[PDB]
Design a protein around this ligand. Sequence first.
Ligand code: NAG
Ligand code: NAG
Ligand code: NAG
Ligand code: NAG
Ligand code: CL
Ligand code: CL
Ligand code: CL
Ligand code: CL
Ligand code: CL
Ligand code: CL
Lengths: 233, 233, 201, 201
Amino acid sequence: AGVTQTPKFRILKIGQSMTLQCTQDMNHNYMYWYRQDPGMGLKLIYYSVGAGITDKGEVPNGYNVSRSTTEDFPLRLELAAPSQTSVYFCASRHGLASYEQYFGPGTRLTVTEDLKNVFPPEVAVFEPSEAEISATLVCLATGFYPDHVELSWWVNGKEVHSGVCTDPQPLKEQSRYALSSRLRVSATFWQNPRNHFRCQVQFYGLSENDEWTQDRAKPVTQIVSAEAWGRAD
Amino acid sequence: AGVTQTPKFRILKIGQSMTLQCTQDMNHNYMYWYRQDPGMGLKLIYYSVGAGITDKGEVPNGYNVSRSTTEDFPLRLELAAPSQTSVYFCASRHGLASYEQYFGPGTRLTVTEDLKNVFPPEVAVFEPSEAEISATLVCLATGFYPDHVELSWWVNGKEVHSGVCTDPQPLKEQSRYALSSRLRVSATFWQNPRNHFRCQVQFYGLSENDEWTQDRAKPVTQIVSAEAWGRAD
Amino acid sequence: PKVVQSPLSLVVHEGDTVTLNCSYEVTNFRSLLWYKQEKKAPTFLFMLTSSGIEKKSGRLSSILDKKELFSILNITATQTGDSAVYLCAWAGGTSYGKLTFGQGTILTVHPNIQKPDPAVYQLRDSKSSDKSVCLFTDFDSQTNVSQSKDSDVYITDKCVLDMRSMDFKSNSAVAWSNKSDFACANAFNNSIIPEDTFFPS
Amino acid sequence: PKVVQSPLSLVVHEGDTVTLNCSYEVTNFRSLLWYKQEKKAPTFLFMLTSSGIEKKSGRLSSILDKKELFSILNITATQTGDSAVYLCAWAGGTSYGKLTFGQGTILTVHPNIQKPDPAVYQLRDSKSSDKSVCLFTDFDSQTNVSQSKDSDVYITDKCVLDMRSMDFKSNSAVAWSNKSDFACANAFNNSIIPEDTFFPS
Ligand SMILES: *[C@@H]1O[C@H](CO)[C@@H](O)[C@H](O)[C@H]1NC(C)=O
Ligand SMILES: *[C@@H]1O[C@H](CO)[C@@H](O)[C@H](O)[C@H]1NC(C)=O
Ligand SMILES: *[C@@H]1O[C@H](CO)[C@@H](O)[C@H](O)[C@H]1NC(C)=O
Ligand SMILES: *[C@@H]1O[C@H](CO)[C@@H](O)[C@H](O)[C@H]1NC(C)=O
Ligand SMILES: [Cl-]
Ligand SMILES: [Cl-]
Ligand SMILES: [Cl-]
Ligand SMILES: [Cl-]
Ligand SMILES: [Cl-]
Ligand SMILES: [Cl-]
């Protein structure tokens, strides 16, 4: 019930416009917007110490802010630029004699010229193994751009964080990306044919009228998964 | 005038024999032999607490030791093996109520089956630059196997450690290796045509009757260098 | 140069402790705010405002003294999930309020495996052209992992999983291609694995 | 498991301090021997035998207390040439004498550059086919460096040089190929350099 921003993931062509909204019902005076990326660190863009009044941070240009109400402090990108590909964080400082600053879940957006570079991931489940000493099976998402994906495992219809490990960073095939995950279960658990495994990745993508990708299809926002069953062997 | 071993670098085919000699005039009772390599760390092979008496360390096999005199404590590889490619260190513990253990310069040896994999390095000096703001020139040794090389810079006939930086580890082209070095001097220093620069690498290699390499030549122990002169521009 | 943190990068085995030093400008100034960020929005840890101080919350302690620039930031029993970047932030005038974030301290803590049985296996897809994947697992967390050899093949880096039930915490990495000439042994020769490994044949 | 050292890997900016913790077995036992090894035979630093102890030599201090397993190993004003692996060794019975070496503490200390003017230049050979080499220099020591993109090209890692005269300590890395289609800008896009860089054209 703290700071909540939107959307989580975004893609777009250059010279294009976007609005990021941030909401807090926490009843806080001060709201911030931060920009992050691997090499440039975490830096402030815009900030507001109250409703109706804003002011500039370290990187005020490329961005614009209008705050009508205390609860919401959004920001807008008038013209998209490759420099603006990044992870933004809405913050809330309240505050009364308080410097504590709370952040929203964060948002990730990317800017690409052609927009035909966008591809949905290809999911596969690989079922091991010979030499099961005690069973760890892996899932591969391959050839996806942009980098926005949510990967996870569903066993018998339920998501499990139990034995799951996923790569913190995706591999580069040269755009484009490949991610790998894995889970490890008891030897007898995998050997039960009644047990079902699904490796699912949610790919965020275009919404409407891009149009699509080179040689048709579309890279819309979708879910692609892979299926495996218990092997009696 | 401390622990001194020999040779520094060695190469050979498998199933072959080699002797490493270690000498100390420091008048020390205890002499050791250690084996090192990136992943296995530093471990003891053989040790002698006096002349005539030896004993086994962690990895006694593959090796043999005979100590006739207090000063020298050598070791022998009867049959070469790829497992024995490594950096060995002769140590001296003296000692009387003293655990201090001093080491020789270290020796590096490699074992390869075909032995035709041995290649001399190709040296080049690259002379920069446009945009000299203040001049840093680099030397490239390329396509050399085995990995035993000594690189250094000679300015006007004298070796200089002044502005020199060399790569701690060589690059892999797939055997085989490539190493890069560089030095940086004052802008006016390079622009003097009377100043001479030589990037020299000493390559340790075969001695006699290998014979040579595939398609002739030979990879004997030699010195290959590269030459540059001051540019008036 | 308002804030500088040390060490820049820290890597410890599980447990023990870590002391993170933070240096700030003395004119003017306000509370130091400790945050821990891992692959997501920063999480508020400590607020040092005006305090003496001897202060602790949970397994951590924020105690700061003057000592014009310092913070203790101790830790106890470092756990595998504590790997993250730590930021002491900043506060000061004029034009309140604001935060100045340092480069952050990247902290990595390896898990303890007791009886390693490292090995490399081979696995196949469900319905496919019989494309396959090789898996390196059970080794010790210190062992490095090499990137793609010819770059036309794909290899991940060290990643650790866990099971609350069996208490087992196991590392792993995967390497794969579509090629039929692809073989695990032949594949990972790039970096030498301990002889404790396994090559079924 | 006779000896274990922490931290496993440590990276600090120039100066400050480092405290290296060494743990050993208590039955039986003898002197702890501190050595510093960099790309060559280990160099003897400290002998802790039987001592109390409060002990220091030069810029380092070996002080140890019991505290069944500990050693302080402080440091002052870390310098660029102090990058190396540190081993506390071991001594004990039976069957004297012997040393048990731990995994060692890998220590890296970055130099301080004040006014960076990072940039990428292009240079040519003396007598050749006009093969060329690209050079990335003057940047800050924290910036990473990516390995070979297609592996058919060659890129080194961060390396720092110095001049006693001009006091200048400068980092650098090189990237090269024989191809005429090879271009510095096009070459190093693998990792993003700060905009402070230079692309002469
Ligand atoms: C944002 O844009 C509006 C007009 O689109 C402009 O009046 C305002 O000054 C801009 N914000 C800032 C902080 O300048
Ligand atoms: C070394 O070899 C000799 C014979 O070649 C053998 O008698 C001796 O026992 C060997 N050394 C050890 C430590 O066994
Ligand atoms: C932190 O660093 C400062 C100097 O940078 C030093 O004086 C201080 O003692 C350090 N703090 C600790 C706890 O080591
Ligand atoms: C070293 O580690 C031990 C436990 O592993 C701990 O009790 C001791 O306090 C540590 N020493 C220092 C100086 O932190
Ligand atoms: Cl089995
Ligand atoms: Cl994920
Ligand atoms: Cl779960
Ligand atoms: Cl210039
Ligand atoms: Cl060298
Ligand atoms: Cl010199």
